[PDB]
């Protein structure tokens, strides 16, 4: 059935401080010893699409991989047909086109009364034999910040009987990412996100996203 493209618009809303990090050139001058990745122009916290893609793939590797995934190249057919796989014929390019995530409530944050869009979390480590506390500082994209999340799944004539399984995979990836962290030191209360206004709309071509939206939202 003919070409189609389906876009999963959503609003990532950090419930806990996000620390995707990765200061290289611009964010490298942050004077924090762990700056969050920012926009080079507006100095705004950004959730790169690579983080979302990698975290979703690693999360779905624990559900839709019957064999043990020693390498991402040895992933199951379902995962490699969406996220791609460099070492096979049919699955060389995946069906998922992730996009970066930019701050969308900066004006709302100004209205609330914030001065900066990235707080500084102070932590420390306690030695076990001695008890001297070694302190440290790490940046955190403050909570209640929204990012525009936009993922497109392509529907091709040849890959048509696998649409429902793929849709279940995106659902199970987005709702696993809502349960696990999103980058950063997540095992210490970090990177907790939530996808608000989770809505799928066909954009190019035509498809019955009306059956998908009802099973996407709520349940």
């Amino acid at each position: 059935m003919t070409f189609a493209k389906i876009k999963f618009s959503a609003q990532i809303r950090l419930e806990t401080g996000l620390h995707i990090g990765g200061s290289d050139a611009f964010a490298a001058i942050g004077a924090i010893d762990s700056p969050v990745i920012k926009d080079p122009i507006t100095n705004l916290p950004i959730i790169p699409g690579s983080s979302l893609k990698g975290k979703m793939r690693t999360l779905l590797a624990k559900v839709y991989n019957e064999k043990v995934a020693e390498k991402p190249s040895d992933d199951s057919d379902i995962l490699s047909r969406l996220f791609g796989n460099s070492k096979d014929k049919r699955f060389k390019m995946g069906r998922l086109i992730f996009r970066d995530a930019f701050l969308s409530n900066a004006d709302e944050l100004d209205s609330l009364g914030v001065r900066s869009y990235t707080e500084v979390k102070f932590e420390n480590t306690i030695d076990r034999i001695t008890a001297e506390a070694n302190p440290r500082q790490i940046e955190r994209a403050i909570r209640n910040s929204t990012f525009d999340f936009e993922l497109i799944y392509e529907i091709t004539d040849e890959n048509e009987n696998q649409v429902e399984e793929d849709f279940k995979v995106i659902r199970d990836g987005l709702k696993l990412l809502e349960l696990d962290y999103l980058g950063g030191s997540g095992s210490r209360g970090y990177g907790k996100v939530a996808f608000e206004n989770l809505k799928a709309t066909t954009v190019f071509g035509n498809y019955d996203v009306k059956t998908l939206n009802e099973l996407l939202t709520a349940e």
């Binding site: 003919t2 290289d24 122009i41 893609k53 014929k89 086109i97 992730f98 970066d100 190019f204």
Partner: protein, 297 residues
Amino acid sequence: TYKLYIMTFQNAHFGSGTLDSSKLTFSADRIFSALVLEALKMGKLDAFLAEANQDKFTLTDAFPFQFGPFLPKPIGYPKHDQIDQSVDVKEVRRQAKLSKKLQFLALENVDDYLNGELFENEEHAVIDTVTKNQPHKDDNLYQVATTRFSNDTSLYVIANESDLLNELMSSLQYSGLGGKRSSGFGRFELDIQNIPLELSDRLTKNHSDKVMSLTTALPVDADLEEAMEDGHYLLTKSSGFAFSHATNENYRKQDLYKFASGSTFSKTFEGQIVDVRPLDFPHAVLNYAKPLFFKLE
């Protein structure tokens, strides 16, 4: 020759040969390959191939578009016949360095630059590099350079008004262009505009005057000698690994040296949709090097 396809970008990575480099504008080969791949994956490959093989088809390199169609600096026309000045050598070298640093002129002042006027570059995009890792074996650290545009700068391409090309463009605006398209980099939004009345009369394919190529084009052997014997030009390599679904291993597609933009020539010539596939491999790689010219003074 007919339209002024504009594409607003927010983040893109057009490799210059290495993954750590990212050019401001993509060449015509990249967009032609993207369109061919989109037509192949949709199903209508043969229609696009037939349209491309026709002489009516046109495509140009991506050029900046910021409140007015911008264009490539004409290579070889800072000519001293309109650049003779009585200033000291300090100012002469300063203006020579400024001209060499310039890479894109505005359509409103292209003829002005041909008269000897001096112009400067403008804030279009910032080339930033982000470092990422692979936490599956914890022994990887790669870097990707991007070209995040601002100051409301878009990119534009000149192509014919055709339902197929418009459909492929609209399908491409949610597939990205170049680089890690399935990682965030490359996406854009399409708009279709009419060529301004100060450009359509000069955007040409055939006269005998001096015509700036607006495409990375490679003449056929019939008129190559006449092209370089009285021409000013630049050479670019279209090398790379050929993306293909019919091999388990990547193959280096054949290297190709093409005339960049804006290369000035004394006359027009004919391009080529050249096969650069490695030997003994059924489906080929098509490299688009077909001229779209600009008439000058």
